[PDB]
């Protein structure tokens, strides 16, 4: 499947985890920003990797990053 | 069943097979549906419909033609 | 493993085509395989190198094996000006009555096909005259393609594989491949002339049999002992001297008379093997210069270190720029491929202009072919040259280690060296096609005299430097009074000044404002393809639209749509792009050629002087002009024996249209469309009972894109090529 | 604390689409969405047109999950519904995707932990060469 | 007549080579 | 599709239709029939149709009609 | 300067005479007194013209018969090059000039976009003269031409 | 139209749809005829090698021909440009 990071420049907005389609990230808490939180990928199984979540980030530099990797048949979007 | 026809006809023509290319002269594809109802267009003044006295169009006259100058306006 | 490809776990549990597909474009990316070492790299690249040397051996075998046996060589020996050379012959079953008969020429008994490549002035230059000479070298290149594939296997085995120290001690590979590769090679190629090739234009036959008890020189390698090697060039051979027989023969085997053999409009055989004899002694001395196991010579590192101007105006010069190549193999592919680019440009602008092969010139179409080979060739290795480069930015280079050295600056001043190369396009750009379109204006409104016809007088210069006669300017070489004149005075002088003011040879032809014009379109395409290429590489590691472009490598479909979009912001998808320029380039450069020689050859040099400097000339008396007798290859009245190109032109027509659709509509698209068939599959009675053991998908984006420049190529190569040949055979 | 269940809830009302399941669902996986609705109405359907909500519990299955996630991301905005989606396999397992911690993942829960973070964020990750031969990857670190 | 070499090449060879191809694409050690 | 079209429109009419009839009956159209045994073939479609007729327009400089032929290229 | 001047080139007087039996080959249509005549009349008056200048103007003509031109700077062309291309590169540096000046009088304002896509004319109208003494740029050159921070 | 775990295949619709289930319609001996001439090729490998072999040489075999054409027959051949 595709890999996912998150670093700690993320400023717990929350955006990605409402721009996910397919439920890859969640919010955990943290104590590196006045928000208190920071998103995780704990299921970057299920991910497609369209990006809405790197779309989504305000950080200067995107905090939440998608390196397309082995595709499976969850990463093809396949409904077949 | 278009365009491969076409490219059946350019390699037959180049191997130098006239006759086994898809044509009037050979292998002949003639659109009888078409050409049927050509006929029928002649066929309908006077026929079918008696108060027309020529053609709906020239295209369908047969063996009628218009010229205007030197210049051939319209024919079959 | 698991399935293929086993060299990628991760790409064999696909569950998709894509496995095959990927499985196909990665197999020689040794780096990206599963558990490579640096090891198991540098042994599978020694391996192939002798894969591919088998392939080339045995490929130079087959087209011997042909010309021999299906080939007349021994009928065109003896009328070179009227015998066409053949390829091979031609079965091929699906040929209709008619293109059996108009396919068998060159005197064949069947259809055949006529050779183009020029390996028949060659061979017959080289000194091969007959067919039982043409077997013996095809089974000696077959014997060393395999001994090729015999050495490639034993390097794979444990107790033979070269450890990586060894494949990195340049200092003594350059100093055999200068002194050995190089030179001694050279030097026992002028050997082959002086005992056979020479011997053979003058009528004697040199082969194994009596090379021993027979004479290249009647002194016989006394004077070359004694000193007085002058003596080799006592008696060169007459100028009413015919080839390959002793009519006007001499007796000189080193000379350097210069100019053309008057019957061959060909080089010198006594002139090239003095070229040989002279190039091997400075690559003979040349390959002692670096360090080995004998206490002399030089560190590489050690020169590079002290390479380093005061005033520190380039940083740390060249430090660390050593283990920067030596540890990279893709800074020295880059390398490699860039010199090799160029000389084989250099092979085709100096082989139509100084013809070296017995013959040869008087073949058009061969000479137009060749030329237009090599240009492609060339152009590219070129874009690969600049490929690896940014692979090595991207996978090999190190910034710490390469601190403030040239290598580094580069990039640090990345956007100057850029937005240059963006200027000069542009200013080449706005011009060159102002001036095409104002001559155009011009022509359309009647009235050639208002065009802007400016004249390439700096070129012109230079020609007259050279000894051209015309346009006069009194130059060097030119000139009376000239210390240079003087000074190559009755040498190569007199051969040279004779074949520069011959009127029918290529060498240094007249140019005028239509050569102008060319020019800057030539010099437009090689300005906007570097500026593609050297954009690619210096911002292959990031922008400001992504500044972590590393991480990534080299080839990744994008980075989606968010901050603007960013598709082809990969260093792979400006490669992409400036292959689509590079063939602009040398079509412009082949077009140049091919129409200054037609007109040349066909005695009419006002046609292309007159209609070149305006665009719809080109259209009109280049292109639509030579397309008549190809694209009447056949006819709904008859077919010809050009009727092959004008079926591959077609075909190449096609091919290249074929592309667009890969690279106009992309994948979003075509993904929607096969599920639609994935559903169909499954709901259509007796045709479910066979089910796919791949799930059908659509090209990946990047995969797109390479499938597409595969079509646009093929078709930009194969139309040409049928264009080329044909309207040129055609009138010969 | 414990995912749901289920099922022998019924389905809602609809009268077939060529969106529906293939053969992935039966030897590969398929999904399952459930959700409670407060009166009989109508929706979208994600692979077809339309259908009508069935009041009370709903049953829903689904091939892909983002189809799951699509039309119960629309379950909570529009109308207001709770929903939950499962992963069934073709054993007979089941496997409990979303939620998945009590809350949604928008809001912050305590038990959760987290995956795939680097510390040092930025861009200040190392050249490839650095790892080269080294089955890591830069962001891995 | 060794043109008939010709088929060998033209035909034999790759049907055997996809034949081959397709079966060691499609194994699942 | 609509290139194709009005391609087929240019050569029929031409070809089949329009030309030249003098006051003896003889009717001799533009291109003079050779839409039957060349448009069946691409060949002839690049030959006898674009190859034969784009000469008007490349050979219209200092014509009353060089706008057409700065047109053609200006449009490639 | 292998070419032949034209005052003295037989191709180039060919070509003012093959034109003109042209455009009078078309007067013969329209008779006298009419207005093509007098069109065609004056583009013949025009062409004579033409040709008489290039001749007069010392340019060298091509076995063509057309006039090429000498860049390489010698001085009995500089009409041909030299001189119409400074008086380019001193329009092509006022407009430069010009433009520069407006977007530094724009920058450090309110909304400096407002004023790119809605033109301040009294603004422009201010500095469009100063172009006329750009090549006193260089003086700026001497300290304040380019920024320092890159 | 129904839904549970117990029946999966069910669930999903993995349904023997136009199978039919029913006895051979085919008379015997006919059957048994067929059985024991067309049981070499049923082992599958061999039949392989026999359709490759066989297919291969028989293919060959049609090497053999005549109004095929292997003619280019009586026919000055032109020169036919400069020559050759
Ligand atoms: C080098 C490869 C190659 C070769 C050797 C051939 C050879 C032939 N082709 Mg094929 N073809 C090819 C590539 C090739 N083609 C490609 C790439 C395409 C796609 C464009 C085609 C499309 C094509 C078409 C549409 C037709 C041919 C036809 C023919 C036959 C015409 C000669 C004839 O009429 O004699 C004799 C005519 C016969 C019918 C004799 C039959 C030959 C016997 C039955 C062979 C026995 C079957 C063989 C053993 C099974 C293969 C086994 C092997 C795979 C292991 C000839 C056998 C024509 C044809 O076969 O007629 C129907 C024809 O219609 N070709
Ligand atoms: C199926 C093909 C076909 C088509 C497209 C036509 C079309 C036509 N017919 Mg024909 N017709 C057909 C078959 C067809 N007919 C057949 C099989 C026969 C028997 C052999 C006829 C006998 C026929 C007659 C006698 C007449 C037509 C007429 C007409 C024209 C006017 C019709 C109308 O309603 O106007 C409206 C008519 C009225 C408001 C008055 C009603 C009285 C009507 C004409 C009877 C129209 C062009 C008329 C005509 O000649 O037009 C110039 C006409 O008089 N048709
Ligand atoms: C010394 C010569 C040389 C060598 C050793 C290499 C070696 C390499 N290259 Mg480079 N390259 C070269 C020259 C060379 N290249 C030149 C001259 C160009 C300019 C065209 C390039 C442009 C290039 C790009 C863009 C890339 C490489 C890549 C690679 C690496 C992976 C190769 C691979 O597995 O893919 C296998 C290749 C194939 C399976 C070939 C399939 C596609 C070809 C082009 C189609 C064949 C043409 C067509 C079918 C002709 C038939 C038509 C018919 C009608 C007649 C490998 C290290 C890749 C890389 O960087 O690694 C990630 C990469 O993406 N090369
Ligand atoms: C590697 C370069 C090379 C290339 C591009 C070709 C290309 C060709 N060969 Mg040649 N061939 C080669 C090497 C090559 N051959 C060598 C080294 C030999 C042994 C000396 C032969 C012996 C040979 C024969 C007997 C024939 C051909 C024929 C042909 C033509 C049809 C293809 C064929 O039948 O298969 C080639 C068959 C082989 C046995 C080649 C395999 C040899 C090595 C391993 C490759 C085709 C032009 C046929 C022809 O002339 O068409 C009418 C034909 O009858 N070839
Ligand atoms: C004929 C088609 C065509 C043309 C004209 C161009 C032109 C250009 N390319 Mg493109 N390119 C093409 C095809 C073409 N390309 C294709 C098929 C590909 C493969 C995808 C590429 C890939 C490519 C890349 C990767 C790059 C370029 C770049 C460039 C620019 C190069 C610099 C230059 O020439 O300055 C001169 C400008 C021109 C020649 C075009 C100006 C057109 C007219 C003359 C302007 C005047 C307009 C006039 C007033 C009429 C106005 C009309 C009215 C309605 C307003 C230039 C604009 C490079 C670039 O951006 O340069 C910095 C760049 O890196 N090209
Ligand atoms: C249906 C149309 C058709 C077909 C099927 C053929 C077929 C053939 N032609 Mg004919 N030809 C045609 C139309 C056609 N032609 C037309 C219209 C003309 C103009 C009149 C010609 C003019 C012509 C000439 C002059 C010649 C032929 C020859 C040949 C034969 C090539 C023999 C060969 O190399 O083997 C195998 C094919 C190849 C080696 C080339 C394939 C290239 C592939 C794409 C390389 C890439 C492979 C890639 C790595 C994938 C590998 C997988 C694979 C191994 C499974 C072959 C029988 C030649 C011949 O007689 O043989 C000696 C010959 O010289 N043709
Ligand atoms: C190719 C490079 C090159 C370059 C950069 C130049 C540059 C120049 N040339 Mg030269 N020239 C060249 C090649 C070149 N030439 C060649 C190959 C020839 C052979 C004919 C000549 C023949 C030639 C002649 C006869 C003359 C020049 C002159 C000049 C100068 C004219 C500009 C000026 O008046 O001052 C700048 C003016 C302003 C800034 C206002 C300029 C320095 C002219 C000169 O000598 O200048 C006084 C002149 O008389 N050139
Ligand atoms: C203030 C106006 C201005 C000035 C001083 C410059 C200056 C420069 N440009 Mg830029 N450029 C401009 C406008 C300007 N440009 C505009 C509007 C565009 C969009 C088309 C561009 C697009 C552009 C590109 C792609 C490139 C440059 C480059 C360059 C540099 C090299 C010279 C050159 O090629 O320019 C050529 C000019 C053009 C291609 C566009 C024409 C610019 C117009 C004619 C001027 C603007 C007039 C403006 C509306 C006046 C406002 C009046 C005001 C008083 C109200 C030079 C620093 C090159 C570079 O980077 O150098 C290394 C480079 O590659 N320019
Ligand atoms: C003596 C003589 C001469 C000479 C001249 C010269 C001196 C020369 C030259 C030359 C030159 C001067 C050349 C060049 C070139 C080049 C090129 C072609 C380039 C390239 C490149 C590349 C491709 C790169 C890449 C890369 C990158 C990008 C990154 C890093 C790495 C690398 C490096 C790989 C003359 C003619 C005058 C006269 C006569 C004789
Ligand atoms: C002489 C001559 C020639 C040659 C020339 C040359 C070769 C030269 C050069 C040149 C060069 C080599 C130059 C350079 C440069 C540079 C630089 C570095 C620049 C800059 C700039 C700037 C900065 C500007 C700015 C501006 C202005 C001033 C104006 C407007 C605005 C602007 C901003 C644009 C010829 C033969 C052709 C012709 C005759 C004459
Ligand atoms: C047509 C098309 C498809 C669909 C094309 C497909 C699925 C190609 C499938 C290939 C078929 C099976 C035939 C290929 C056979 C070729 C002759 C290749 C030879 C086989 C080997 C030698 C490689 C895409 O998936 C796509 C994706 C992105 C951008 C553009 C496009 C696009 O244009
Ligand atoms: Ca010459």
Same mark, same amino acid.
């Given at each position: 499947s595709h890999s996912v990071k998150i670093y700690?420049?993320?400023?717990?907005?929350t955006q990605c985890v409402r721009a996910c389609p397919t439920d890859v990230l969640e919010m955990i808490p943290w104590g590196g920003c006045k928000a208190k939180q920071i998103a995780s990928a704990p299921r970057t199984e299920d991910c497609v990797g369209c990006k809405r979540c790197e779309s989504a980030c305000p950080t200067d530099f995107l905090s939440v990053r998608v390196y397309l990797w082995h595709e499976t048949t969850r990463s093809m979007g396949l409904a077949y | 069943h278009s365009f491969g026809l076409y490219i059946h006809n350019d390699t037959m023509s180049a191997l130098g097979r006239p006759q086994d290319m898809f044509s009037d002269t050979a292998i002949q594809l003639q659109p009888v549906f078409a050409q049927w109802i050509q006929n029928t267009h002649a066929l309908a003044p006077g026929t079918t419909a008696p108060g027309a006295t020529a053609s709906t169009s020239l295209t369908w006259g047969g063996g009628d033609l218009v010229a205007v100058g030197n210049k051939v306006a319209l024919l079959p | 493993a698991l399935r293929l490809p086993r060299f990628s776990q991760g790409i064999a549990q696909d569950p998709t085509t894509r496995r095959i597909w990927f499985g196909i474009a990665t197999a020689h990316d040794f780096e990206s395989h599963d558990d490579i070492t640096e090891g198991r790299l540098y042994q599978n690249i020694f391996a192939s190198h002798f894969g591919q040397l088998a392939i080339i051996f045995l490929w130079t075998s087959g087209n011997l094996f042909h010309v021999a046996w299906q080939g007349n060589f021994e009928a065109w020996v003896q009328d070179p000006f009227h015998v066409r050379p053949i390829a091979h012959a031609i079965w091929d079953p699906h040929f209709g009555q008619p293109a059996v008969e108009a396919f068998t020429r060159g005197g064949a008994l069947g259809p055949v096909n006529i050779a183009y490549s020029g390996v028949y002035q060659w061979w017959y230059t080289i000194g091969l005259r007959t067919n039982e000479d043409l077997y013996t070298g095809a089974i000696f290149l077959l014997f060393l393609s395999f001994i090729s594939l015999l050495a490639g296997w034993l390097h794979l085995q444990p107790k033979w594989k070269p450890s990586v120290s060894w494949f990195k001690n340049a200092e003594s590979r350059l100093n055999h491949h200068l002194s050995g590769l190089f030179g001694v090679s050279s030097l026992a190629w002028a050997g082959h002339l002086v005992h056979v090739a020479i011997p053979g234009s003058r009528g004697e036959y040199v082969r194994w049999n009596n090379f021993l008890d027979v004479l290249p020189y009647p002194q016989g390698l006394g004077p070359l002992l004694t000193g007085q090697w002058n003596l080799y060039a006592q008696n060169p051979s007459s100028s009413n001297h015919l080839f390959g027989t002793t009519q006007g023969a001499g007796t000189a085997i080193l000379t350097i008379l210069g100019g053309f053999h008057p019957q061959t409009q060909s080089l010198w055989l006594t002139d090239m093997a003095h070229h040989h004899l002279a190039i091997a002694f400075l690559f003979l001395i040349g390959g002692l210069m670096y360090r080995t196991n004998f206490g002399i010579g030089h560190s590489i590192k050690y020169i590079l270190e002290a390479h380093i101007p005061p005033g520190g105006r380039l940083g740390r010069g060249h430090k660390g720029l050593y283990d920067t190549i030596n540890n990279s193999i893709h800074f020295q592919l880059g390398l490699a491929l860039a010199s090799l680019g160029v000389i084989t440009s250099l092979v085709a602008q100096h082989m139509y202009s100084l013809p070296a092969y017995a013959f040869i010139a008087q073949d058009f179409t061969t000479q137009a072919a060749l030329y237009t080979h090599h240009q492609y060739i060339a152009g590219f290795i070129m874009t690969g040259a600049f490929a690896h480069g940014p692979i090595f930015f991207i996978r090999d280079y190190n910034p710490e280690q390469n601190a403030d050295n040239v290598l580094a600056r580069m990039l640090e001043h990345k956007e100057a060296i850029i937005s240059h190369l963006s200027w000069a396009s542009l200013f080449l750009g706005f011009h060159t096609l102002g001036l095409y379109v104002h001559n155009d204006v011009m022509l359309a409104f009647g009235t050639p005299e208002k065009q802007i016809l400016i004249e390439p007088i700096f070129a012109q210069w230079i020609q007259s430097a050279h000894g051209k006669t015309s346009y006069g300017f009194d130059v060097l070489l030119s000139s009376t009074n000239g210390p240079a004149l003087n000074a190559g005075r009755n040498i190569w002088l007199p051969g040279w000044l004779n074949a520069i003011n011959e009127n029918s040879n290529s060498l240094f032809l007249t140019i005028g404002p239509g050569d102008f014009l060319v020019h800057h379109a030539i010099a437009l395409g090689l300005h906007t393809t570097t500026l593609i290429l050297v954009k690619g590489a210096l911002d292959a590691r990031g922008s400001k639209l992504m500044p972590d472009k590393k991480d990534f490598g080299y080839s990744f479909p994008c980075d989606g749509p968010g901050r603007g979009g960013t598709c082809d912001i990969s260093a792979w998808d400006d490669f992409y792009l400036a292959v689509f320029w590079m063939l602009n380039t040398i079509g412009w450069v082949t077009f140049y050629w091919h129409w200054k020689h037609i007109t040349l050859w066909r005695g009419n040099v006002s046609q292309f002087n007159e209609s070149s400097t305006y665009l719809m000339g080109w259209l009109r008396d280049y292109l639509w002009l030579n397309s008549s007798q190809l694209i009447n290859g056949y006819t709904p009245l008859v077919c010809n024996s050009l009727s092959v190109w004008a079926w591959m032109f077609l075909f190449g027509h096609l091919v290249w249209a074929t592309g667009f659709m890969f690279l106009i509509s992309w994948r979003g698209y075509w993904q929607e469309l096969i599920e639609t068939l994935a559903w169909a599959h499954e709901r259509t009675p007796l045709a479910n009972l066979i089910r796919w053991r791949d799930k059908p998908v659509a090209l990946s984006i990047v995969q797109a894109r390479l499938v597409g420049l595969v079509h646009f190529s093929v078709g930009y190569i194969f139309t040409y090529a049928a264009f080329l040949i044909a309207s040129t055979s055609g009138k010969f | 604390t414990p995912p749901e269940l289920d099922p022998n809830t019924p389905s809602p009302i609809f009268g077939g689409s060529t969106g529906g399941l293939l053969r992935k669902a039966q030897v590969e996986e398929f999904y399952v969405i459930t959700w409670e609705s407060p009166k009989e109405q109508i929706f979208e359907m994600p692979t077809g047109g339309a259908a009508i909500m069935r009041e009370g519990p709903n049953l829903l299955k689904l091939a892909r999950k983002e189809q799951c996630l699509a039309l119960g991301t629309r379950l909570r905005s529009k109308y207001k519904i709770k929903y939950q989606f499962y992963r069934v396999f073709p054993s007979g397992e089941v496997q409990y995707l979303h939620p998945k911690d009590g809350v949604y993942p928008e809001k912050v829960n305590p038990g959760r932990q987290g995956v795939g973070v680097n510390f040092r964020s930025i861009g200040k990750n190392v050249s490839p060469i650095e790892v080269k031969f080294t089955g890591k990857q830069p962001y891995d670190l | 007549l060794p043109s008939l070499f010709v088929p060998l090449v033209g035909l034999l060879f790759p049907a055997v080579a996809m034949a081959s191809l397709f079966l060691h694409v499609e194994k699942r050690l | 599709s609509i290139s194709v079209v009005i391609f087929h429109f240019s050569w029929k009419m031409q070809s089949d239709v329009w030309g030249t009839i003098n006051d003896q009956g003889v009717v001799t159209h533009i291109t003079t029939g050779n839409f039957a045994q060349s448009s069946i073939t691409i060949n002839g479609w690049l030959r006898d149709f674009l190859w034969a007729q784009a000469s008007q327009v490349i050979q219209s400089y200092g014509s009353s009609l060089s706008a057409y032929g700065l047109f053609f290229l200006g449009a490639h | 300067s292998g070419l032949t001047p034209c005052k003295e080139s037989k191709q180039f007087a060919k070509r003012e005479k093959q034109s003109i039996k042209k455009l009078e080959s078309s007067l013969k249509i329209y008779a006298a007194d009419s207005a093509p005549a007098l069109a065609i009349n004056a583009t013949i008056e025009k062409t004579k013209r033409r040709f008489d200048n290039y001749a007069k103007q010392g340019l060298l003509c091509g076995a063509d018969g057309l006039p090429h031109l000498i860049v390489s700077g010698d001085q009995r062309h500089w009409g041909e090059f030299i001189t119409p291309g400074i008086l380019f590169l001193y329009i092509a540096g006022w407009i430069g000039w010009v433009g520069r000046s407006y977007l530094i009088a724009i920058r450090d304002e309110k909304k400096p976009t407002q004023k790119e896509i809605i033109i301040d004319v009294p603004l422009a109208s201010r500095l469009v003269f100063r172009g006329f003494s750009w090549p006193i740029a260089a003086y700026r050159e001497l300290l304040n031409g380019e920024l320092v921070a890159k | 139209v129904y839904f549970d775990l117990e029946d999966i295949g069910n669930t999903t619709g993995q349904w023997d749809l136009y199978? #039919?289930?029913?006895? #051979?319609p085919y008379s015997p001996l006919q059957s048994k005829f067929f059985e024991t001439f067309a049981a070499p090729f049923t082992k599958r490998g061999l039949l392989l090698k026999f359709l490759i072999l066989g297919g291969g040489s028989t293919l060959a075999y049609f090497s053999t021909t005549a109004s095929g054409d292997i003619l280019p027959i009586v026919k000055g051949p032109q020169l036919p440009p400069k020559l050759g």
């Open positions: 700690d420049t993320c400023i717990g907005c | - | - | - | - | - | - | 199978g #039919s289930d029913a006895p #051979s």
